[PDB]
PDB file of C-alpha atoms in Angstrom:
ATOM      1  CA  UNK A  59      24.255  31.306  67.914  1.00  0.00           C
ATOM      2  CA  UNK A  60      24.322  27.625  66.942  1.00  0.00           C
ATOM      3  CA  UNK A  61      27.498  27.902  64.866  1.00  0.00           C
ATOM      4  CA  UNK A  62      28.098  27.139  61.219  1.00  0.00           C
ATOM      5  CA  UNK A  63      25.449  24.952  59.575  1.00  0.00           C
ATOM      6  CA  UNK A  64      25.949  23.464  56.087  1.00  0.00           C
ATOM      7  CA  UNK A  65      23.241  24.297  53.566  1.00  0.00           C
ATOM      8  CA  UNK A  66      23.145  21.327  51.171  1.00  0.00           C
ATOM      9  CA  UNK A  67      24.642  18.626  53.406  1.00  0.00           C
ATOM     10  CA  UNK A  68      22.290  16.039  54.882  1.00  0.00           C
ATOM     11  CA  UNK A  69      21.317  16.705  58.498  1.00  0.00           C
ATOM     12  CA  UNK A  70      23.598  14.477  60.583  1.00  0.00           C
ATOM     13  CA  UNK A  71      24.423  14.411  64.299  1.00  0.00           C
ATOM     14  CA  UNK A  72      27.766  16.118  64.799  1.00  0.00           C
ATOM     15  CA  UNK A  73      28.065  17.145  68.455  1.00  0.00           C
ATOM     16  CA  UNK A  74      27.092  15.946  71.920  1.00  0.00           C
ATOM     17  CA  UNK A  75      23.343  16.244  72.433  1.00  0.00           C
ATOM     18  CA  UNK A  76      22.369  15.739  68.791  1.00  0.00           C
ATOM     19  CA  UNK A  77      19.613  13.241  68.025  1.00  0.00           C
ATOM     20  CA  UNK A  78      19.599  10.302  65.613  1.00  0.00           C
ATOM     21  CA  UNK A  79      16.917   7.812  64.587  1.00  0.00           C
ATOM     22  CA  UNK A  80      17.769   4.113  64.949  1.00  0.00           C
ATOM     23  CA  UNK A  81      15.576   1.658  63.047  1.00  0.00           C
ATOM     24  CA  UNK A  82      15.848  -1.524  65.104  1.00  0.00           C
ATOM     25  CA  UNK A  83      15.684  -4.404  62.610  1.00  0.00           C
ATOM     26  CA  UNK A  84      17.384  -7.548  63.926  1.00  0.00           C
ATOM     27  CA  UNK A  85      16.914 -11.018  62.420  1.00  0.00           C
ATOM     28  CA  UNK A  86      19.407 -13.657  63.596  1.00  0.00           C
ATOM     29  CA  UNK A  87      18.941 -17.411  63.164  1.00  0.00           C
ATOM     30  CA  UNK A  88      21.519 -20.163  63.699  1.00  0.00           C
ATOM     31  CA  UNK A  89      21.069 -23.930  63.674  1.00  0.00           C
ATOM     32  CA  UNK A  90      23.135 -27.105  63.821  1.00  0.00           C
ATOM     33  CA  UNK A  91      22.387 -30.824  63.835  1.00  0.00           C
ATOM     34  CA  UNK A  92      24.287 -34.090  63.566  1.00  0.00           C
ATOM     35  CA  UNK A  93      23.827 -37.833  63.945  1.00  0.00           C
ATOM     36  CA  UNK A  94      25.747 -41.101  63.777  1.00  0.00           C
ATOM     37  CA  UNK A  95      24.794 -44.766  63.627  1.00  0.00           C
ATOM     38  CA  UNK A  96      26.367 -48.199  63.383  1.00  0.00           C
ATOM     39  CA  UNK A  97      24.869 -51.653  62.986  1.00  0.00           C
ATOM     40  CA  UNK A  98      26.129 -55.227  62.799  1.00  0.00           C
ATOM     41  CA  UNK A  99      24.136 -58.439  62.338  1.00  0.00           C
ATOM     42  CA  UNK A 100      25.628 -61.911  62.099  1.00  0.00           C
ATOM     43  CA  UNK A 101      24.004 -65.335  61.786  1.00  0.00           C
ATOM     44  CA  UNK A 102      25.770 -68.664  61.305  1.00  0.00           C
ATOM     45  CA  UNK A 103      24.592 -72.264  61.288  1.00  0.00           C
ATOM     46  CA  UNK A 104      25.636 -75.781  60.334  1.00  0.00           C
ATOM     47  CA  UNK A 105      23.595 -78.959  60.570  1.00  0.00           C
ATOM     48  CA  UNK A 106      24.073 -82.599  59.564  1.00  0.00           C
ATOM     49  CA  UNK A 107      20.557 -83.990  59.179  1.00  0.00           C
ATOM     50  CA  UNK A 108      21.676 -87.388  57.840  1.00  0.00           C
ATOM     51  CA  UNK A 109      25.239 -88.536  58.542  1.00  0.00           C
ATOM     52  CA  UNK A 110      26.720 -91.372  56.448  1.00  0.00           C
ATOM     53  CA  UNK A 111      28.351 -94.209  58.345  1.00  0.00           C
ATOM     54  CA  UNK A 112      31.948 -93.381  57.394  1.00  0.00           C
ATOM     55  CA  UNK A 113      31.370 -89.840  58.724  1.00  0.00           C
ATOM     56  CA  UNK A 114      29.549 -90.877  61.918  1.00  0.00           C
ATOM     57  CA  UNK A 115      32.584 -90.671  64.198  1.00  0.00           C
ATOM     58  CA  UNK A 116      33.223 -87.124  62.980  1.00  0.00           C
TER      59      UNK A 116
ATOM     60  CA  UNK B  74      -7.908  24.239  53.820  1.00  0.00           C
ATOM     61  CA  UNK B  75      -5.216  21.581  53.535  1.00  0.00           C
ATOM     62  CA  UNK B  76      -7.067  19.588  50.895  1.00  0.00           C
ATOM     63  CA  UNK B  77      -7.359  22.002  47.973  1.00  0.00           C
ATOM     64  CA  UNK B  78      -5.830  22.265  44.509  1.00  0.00           C
ATOM     65  CA  UNK B  79      -3.907  25.521  44.016  1.00  0.00           C
ATOM     66  CA  UNK B  80      -2.628  26.100  40.472  1.00  0.00           C
ATOM     67  CA  UNK B  81      -0.921  29.492  40.374  1.00  0.00           C
ATOM     68  CA  UNK B  82       0.677  31.261  37.419  1.00  0.00           C
ATOM     69  CA  UNK B  83       1.967  34.608  38.772  1.00  0.00           C
ATOM     70  CA  UNK B  84       4.085  33.304  41.687  1.00  0.00           C
ATOM     71  CA  UNK B  85       7.638  31.946  41.529  1.00  0.00           C
ATOM     72  CA  UNK B  86       9.749  30.538  44.357  1.00  0.00           C
ATOM     73  CA  UNK B  87      13.139  32.258  44.277  1.00  0.00           C
ATOM     74  CA  UNK B  88      16.474  32.255  46.078  1.00  0.00           C
ATOM     75  CA  UNK B  89      17.929  35.632  47.077  1.00  0.00           C
ATOM     76  CA  UNK B  90      21.665  36.240  47.451  1.00  0.00           C
ATOM     77  CA  UNK B  91      23.343  39.322  48.891  1.00  0.00           C
ATOM     78  CA  UNK B  92      26.680  40.617  50.144  1.00  0.00           C
ATOM     79  CA  UNK B  93      27.131  41.869  53.692  1.00  0.00           C
ATOM     80  CA  UNK B  94      29.514  44.847  53.398  1.00  0.00           C
ATOM     81  CA  UNK B  95      32.305  45.732  55.830  1.00  0.00           C
ATOM     82  CA  UNK B  96      31.176  47.760  58.853  1.00  0.00           C
ATOM     83  CA  UNK B  97      27.532  47.383  57.848  1.00  0.00           C
ATOM     84  CA  UNK B  98      25.024  49.299  59.969  1.00  0.00           C
ATOM     85  CA  UNK B  99      21.316  48.689  60.454  1.00  0.00           C
ATOM     86  CA  UNK B 100      19.172  50.835  58.184  1.00  0.00           C
ATOM     87  CA  UNK B 101      21.606  50.652  55.265  1.00  0.00           C
ATOM     88  CA  UNK B 102      20.517  49.190  51.932  1.00  0.00           C
ATOM     89  CA  UNK B 103      22.307  46.666  49.718  1.00  0.00           C
ATOM     90  CA  UNK B 104      21.710  45.126  46.306  1.00  0.00           C
ATOM     91  CA  UNK B 105      20.349  41.591  45.987  1.00  0.00           C
ATOM     92  CA  UNK B 106      20.241  38.954  43.253  1.00  0.00           C
ATOM     93  CA  UNK B 107      17.027  36.976  42.719  1.00  0.00           C
ATOM     94  CA  UNK B 108      17.200  33.605  40.956  1.00  0.00           C
ATOM     95  CA  UNK B 109      14.339  31.256  40.120  1.00  0.00           C
ATOM     96  CA  UNK B 110      14.512  27.746  41.571  1.00  0.00           C
ATOM     97  CA  UNK B 111      12.152  25.508  39.593  1.00  0.00           C
ATOM     98  CA  UNK B 112      10.393  25.389  36.199  1.00  0.00           C
ATOM     99  CA  UNK B 113       9.619  29.113  36.116  1.00  0.00           C
ATOM    100  CA  UNK B 114       9.673  30.845  32.743  1.00  0.00           C
ATOM    101  CA  UNK B 115      10.449  34.501  33.504  1.00  0.00           C
ATOM    102  CA  UNK B 116      10.664  37.047  36.355  1.00  0.00           C
ATOM    103  CA  UNK B 117      10.403  40.121  34.046  1.00  0.00           C
ATOM    104  CA  UNK B 118       8.004  42.301  36.075  1.00  0.00           C
ATOM    105  CA  UNK B 119       7.992  40.541  39.408  1.00  0.00           C
ATOM    106  CA  UNK B 120       8.159  41.853  42.953  1.00  0.00           C
ATOM    107  CA  UNK B 121      10.123  40.217  45.766  1.00  0.00           C
ATOM    108  CA  UNK B 122       8.168  39.895  49.007  1.00  0.00           C
ATOM    109  CA  UNK B 123       9.636  40.094  52.513  1.00  0.00           C
ATOM    110  CA  UNK B 124      12.691  37.826  52.500  1.00  0.00           C
ATOM    111  CA  UNK B 125      15.006  37.325  55.508  1.00  0.00           C
ATOM    112  CA  UNK B 126      18.641  36.991  54.428  1.00  0.00           C
ATOM    113  CA  UNK B 127      20.476  34.517  56.659  1.00  0.00           C
ATOM    114  CA  UNK B 128      24.201  34.201  57.228  1.00  0.00           C
ATOM    115  CA  UNK B 129      26.329  31.092  57.534  1.00  0.00           C
ATOM    116  CA  UNK B 130      25.301  30.956  61.213  1.00  0.00           C
ATOM    117  CA  UNK B 131      21.610  30.896  60.136  1.00  0.00           C
ATOM    118  CA  UNK B 132      20.889  34.337  61.611  1.00  0.00           C
ATOM    119  CA  UNK B 133      18.939  37.104  59.887  1.00  0.00           C
ATOM    120  CA  UNK B 134      21.238  39.958  58.860  1.00  0.00           C
ATOM    121  CA  UNK B 135      19.018  41.728  56.307  1.00  0.00           C
ATOM    122  CA  UNK B 136      15.469  41.877  54.969  1.00  0.00           C
ATOM    123  CA  UNK B 137      14.863  41.941  51.213  1.00  0.00           C
ATOM    124  CA  UNK B 138      11.866  43.392  49.370  1.00  0.00           C
ATOM    125  CA  UNK B 139      11.644  45.288  46.103  1.00  0.00           C
ATOM    126  CA  UNK B 140      11.065  45.213  42.361  1.00  0.00           C
ATOM    127  CA  UNK B 141      13.247  43.078  40.100  1.00  0.00           C
ATOM    128  CA  UNK B 142      15.014  44.503  37.049  1.00  0.00           C
ATOM    129  CA  UNK B 143      15.454  41.938  34.258  1.00  0.00           C
ATOM    130  CA  UNK B 144      17.252  42.829  31.026  1.00  0.00           C
ATOM    131  CA  UNK B 145      14.867  41.251  28.534  1.00  0.00           C
TER     132      UNK B 145
END
């Protein structure tokens, strides 16, 4: 005797020793990315090509 | 052969229900109810072939075979 068995219920595992089908379908995907930047450019100039007389000493 | 077209007209798949009486003994006879299961039209003059009647524990407690009586 295997005990009471439901008639219309779907066949499910209920006790120790019962079998069950596992459909292994795994799809995992993780990603991450980052960046940082900094820039600085500086140019400066001053030139006196021709200096008038009253400015010579300066 | 597995690959063959069988189109019958005189056969109907049926479900048989019965009552197990108190203190039932082997060799005793009981009444059964025969009910069609799919798209059959009538069971007026049919005959029920050897049918094992299972209990809740899925064990055979009776065997059913006979001629059906339908009011009509």
